[PDB]
Curated annotation (Swiss-Prot), chain E:
This is Transcription initiation factor IIB. The gene is GTF2B. Zn(2+) binds at residues 2, 5, 21, 24. DNA binds at residues 40, 88, 90, 125, 132, 184, 208, 217, 220, 222, 226. Its main location: nucleus. It comes from Homo sapiens (Human). It catalyses: L-lysyl-[protein] + acetyl-CoA = N(6)-acetyl-L-lysyl-[protein] + CoA + H(+). General transcription factor that plays a role in transcription initiation by RNA polymerase II (Pol II). Involved in the pre-initiation complex (PIC) formation and Pol II recruitment at promoter DNA. Together with the TATA box-bound TBP forms the core initiation complex and provides a bridge between TBP and the Pol II-TFIIF complex. Released from the PIC early following the onset of transcription during the initiation and elongation transition and reassociates with TBP during the next transcription cycle. Associates with chromatin to core promoter-specific regions.
Length: 64, 49, 49, 49, 252, 48, 44, 49
């Protein structure tokens, strides 16, 4: 639902890169370029953001 | 329809949560004509039965 | 490289990202044991209790 | 074939990945209970015995 | 029944379904408890007549969309009345209609005698006669109805906004509190209050419209409205938005 | 071990309570087994 | 004994005997409030 | 392929027939007494619901 804190494979921090990744994509960055800019070199950490589905955003559309 | 009989629209989630069937009331217009073997005819219709 | 010894594995391994699914079948929902349990009254035979 | 623990359609998982939320899931069980006043002789209500 | 512990409260056990001495450990009875079930974890005339009345009760209920619990309550009233047999002369349909009326009153959602009559072949006069008899036979009583017991149904059936319904309830309750309508039927007071509240909002309902749902002749609504009209500003809630100013409410 | 006359049911046996137990349902309402209902019918006709 | 309305989200104290309904909303779906008892989680 | 429509139309055909079979019975009984009948009371709503 929400971006994992760590990369599952290696434990690298990924929970502080989702908003930065979305911001870069809005800046016309390709997904590969945006991941490179954030320092995600290993394809395990790129997998984390490339495949993340942010369901929490739609979960917040339901009134508590 | 509540206990007091006040109708309210039923959202599907309320039907799921309260275990209510999701049904729509069905109304039919009915025309009733009566003949009294006295060469008189009376036609009455019950709208939305 | 071997995790336990750190030595290169002689054969090179095919490794990459693959999409995996977790199926509803967990072992905890299936593990069950019986040892002098609640027999039935009429049949005097085992039953779930 | 790492340690023989994935043989015959078995899988070796990474414990550290599991520690980080890998394939962690939630199980929701819902129980519904209603109180029925049917029958003057017998009646049931919600209250801690 | 511990042989060592005479009169000992044996403790039930769900592991194997046996009762054990609470302070010895001895299992008295091997697996006798039956844990699984113990814990949740050619028709007689009287029955045939009862069955038809039960069918009639359900048929009446669906016409006005009453919940099954009231129907279940109505069935119990009918069985008590049918068993006691003080209404043997009265028709079963009349008894059932009165039982349906009583069941509604007992549950806090009264239906007026006219509403029960509309769903039954039995007239209001006959239902009222049966209603009193059933109370005597069952030695029971029903709380006196109030003007607010019909606001939800009447206002909703009129498609009036919630604020109007609250305003009408406040008006009707205040009018009874102020004794502006002594002796008037609660339904008439409610109908007049609905008209007063309705005319003060965007959604305006004529006297005929309010009478139809409430079953009160417009003349009676006119009489009650005239009695509460003088104190219109006082009856209305303080925090009420007047689409039509109170000073300009219809006079009649 | 067997005689033709014994085939005719002159005296009807009654199964023990173990064969047909008194089930408990809806509280203390002992739900008699199907055999009990037939046995209750059998005795009523026999007495009549 | 606090119940939260499912529509207006209004906390209201309701007894066991009295009927279940929103004090002001009229909504008949109510949710129990979170327990005040403290439950510990291992962040594992 | 029989979808919800055709399947439900088959049911409604029979249920409406029972409804119209019922109003005949109720209406005829009142007509036999000679008194006029009320259409709304004749209709049994539970049949289709
Ligand atoms: Zn990684
Ligand atoms: Zn002992
Ligand atoms: Zn509410």
């Amino acid at each position: 639902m929400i971006i994992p804190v760590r990369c599952f494979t290696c434990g690298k921090i990924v929970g502080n890169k989702w908003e930065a990744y979305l911001g870069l994509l809005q800046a016309e960055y390709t997904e590969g370029d945006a991941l490179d800019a954030l320092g995600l070199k290993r394809y395990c950490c790129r997998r984390m953001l490339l495949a993340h589905v942010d369901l929490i955003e739609k979960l917040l559309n339901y009134a508590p | 329809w509540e206990r007091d009989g006040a109708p309210s629209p039923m959202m599907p989630n309320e039907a799921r949560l309260r275990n209510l069937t999701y049904s729509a009331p069905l109304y039919v217009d009915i025309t009733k004509t009566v003949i009294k073997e006295g060469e008189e005819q009376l036609q009455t219709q019950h709208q939305k039965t | 490289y071997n995790g336990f010894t750190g030595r290169k594995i002689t054969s090179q391994i095919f490794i990459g990202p693959t999409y995996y699914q977790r199926l509803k079948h967990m072992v905890d929902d299936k593990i069950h044991s019986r040892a002098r349990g609640p027999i039935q009254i009429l049949n005097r035979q085992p039953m779930e209790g | 074939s790492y340690t023989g623990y994935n043989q015959e359609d078995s899988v070796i998982m990474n414990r550290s990945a599991v520690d980080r939320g890998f394939f962690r899931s939630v199980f929701y069980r819902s129980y519904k209970e209603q109180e029925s006043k049917k029958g003057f002789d017998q009646e049931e209500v919600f209250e801690k015995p | 029944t511990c042989p060592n512990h005479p009169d000992a409260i044996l403790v039930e056990d769900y592991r194997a379904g046996d009762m054990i001495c609470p302070e010895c450990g001895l299992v008295v009875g091997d697996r006798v408890i039956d844990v699984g079930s113990e814990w949740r974890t050619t028709m007689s005339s009287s029955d045939r007549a009862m069955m038809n009345a039960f069918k009639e009760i359900t048929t009446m209920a669906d016409r006005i969309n009453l919940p099954r619990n009231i129907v279940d309550r109505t069935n119990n009233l009918f069985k008590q009345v049918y068993e006691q047999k003080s209404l043997k002369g009265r028709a079963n349909d009349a008894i059932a209609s009165a039982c349906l009326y009583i069941a509604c009153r007992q549950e806090g959602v009264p239906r007026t005698f006219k509403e029960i009559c509309a769903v039954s072949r039995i007239s209001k006069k006959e239902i009222g006669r049966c209603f009193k008899l059933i109370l005597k036979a069952l030695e029971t009583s029903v709380d006196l109805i109030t003007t607010g017991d019909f606001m939800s149904r009447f206002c909703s059936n009129l498609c009036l906004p919630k604020q109007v319904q609250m305003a009408a309830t406040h008006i009707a309750r205040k009018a009874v509190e102020l004794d502006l309508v002594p002796g008037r039927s609660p339904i008439s007071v409610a109908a007049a209050a609905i008209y007063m509240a309705s005319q003060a909002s965007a959604e305006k309902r004529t006297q005929k419209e309010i009478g139809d749902i409430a079953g009160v002749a417009d003349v009676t609504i006119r009489q009650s409205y005239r009695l509460i009209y003088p104190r219109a500003p006082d009856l209305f809630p303080t925090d009420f938005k007047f689409d039509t100013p109170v000073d300009k409410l219809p006079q009649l | 071990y067997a005689r033709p006359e014994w085939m005719i049911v002159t005296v009807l046996p009654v199964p023990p309570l173990s064969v047909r137990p008194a089930v408990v349902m809806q509280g203390s309402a002992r739900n008699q087994d199907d055999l009990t209902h037939k046995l209750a019918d059998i005795v009523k006709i026999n007495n009549q | 004994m606090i119940y939260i309305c499912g529509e207006c989200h209004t906390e209201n104290e309701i007894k066991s005997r009295d009927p279940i309904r929103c004090r002001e909303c009229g909504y008949r779906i109510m949710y129990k409030k979170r327990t005040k008892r403290l439950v510990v989680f291992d962040a594992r | 392929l029989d979808l919800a429509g055709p399947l439900l139309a088959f049911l409604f055909r029979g249920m409406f027939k029972n409804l119209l079979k019922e109003v005949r019975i109720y209406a005829q009984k009142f007509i036999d007494r000679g008194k006029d009948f009320n259409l709304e009371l004749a209709i049994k709503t539970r049949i289709i619901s």
